[PDB]
Amino acid sequence: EELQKSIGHKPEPTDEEWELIKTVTEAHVATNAQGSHWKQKRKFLPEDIGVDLEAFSHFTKIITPAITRVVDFAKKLPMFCELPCEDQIILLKGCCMEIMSLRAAVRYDPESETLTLNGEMAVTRGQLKNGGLGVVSDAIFDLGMSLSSFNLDDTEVALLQAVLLMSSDRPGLACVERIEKYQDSFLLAFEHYINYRKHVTHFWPKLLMKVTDLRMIGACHASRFLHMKVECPTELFPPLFLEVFE
Ligand SMILES: N[C@@H](Cc1cc(I)c(Oc2ccc(O)c(I)c2)c(I)c1)C(=O)O
Secondary structure (H helix, E strand, C coil): CHHHHHHCCCCCCCHHHHHHHHHHHHHHHHCCCCCCCHHHHCEECCCCCCCCHHHHHHHHHCHHHHHHHHHHHHHCCHHHHCCCHHHHHHHHHHHHHHHHHHHHHCCCECCCCEEEECCCEEECHHHHHHHHHCHHHHHHHHHHHHHHHHCCCHHHHHHHHHHHHCCCCCCCCCCHHHHHHHHHHHHHHHHHHHHHHCCCCCHHHHHHHHHHHHHHHHHHHHHHHHHHHHHCCCCCCCHHHHHHHC
């Protein structure tokens, strides 16, 4: 590999990696709300709506499905299934917001300047921000605008998600080595898929910087959550939302 890159060849996926790629892609497509017809099926949140009580209410009433779809995505990855229960929980809690944010970001529309949540609710920066996210909204929107020129396909989005999922640095993990090895497997297949796609200069390095940003979005959301349960009541939070962000 290192030798091949030296010569200047950009290795494309092996047959082994194409299998992994098909698996991850299908896992994402099956659990991606509203499939590919999301634009027609989206409804714009009334300009008047939107910590703003009602805005927060709308978002939190649909976060349960969004969350379980992330779990559904992970369940369809055999590597994820090989991990012990404790690690599975830790990986899910860790990447949940990161992946949900990605899925919202990739559905940014310059025309309306909105993101689409769960493929059905189109919101502006101001609305998402006032409904509880604060600056996390700015971060997700900036990412979305930024990603439009990356022209990511379902496979690329799927692989980003898999890389986020398999983070061996989540506190409390037991299977550090194994999870890192899983991630390396995804990263390699990812880079090979990107060579095959032939996008844009320094594409791969630029994409990896997005991984870091999604990381940040997850972390700031944790802080936002602490700010929220100081304001909003506790009864305003759905049970699964509480389980994941504790
Ligand atoms: N759109 C995604 C899922 C998704 C659903 C929702 I509601 C989102 O807004 C949030 C998220 C966390 C919060 O604490 C609050 I308040 C609002 C986002 I960002 C993403 C998908 O397609 O799976």
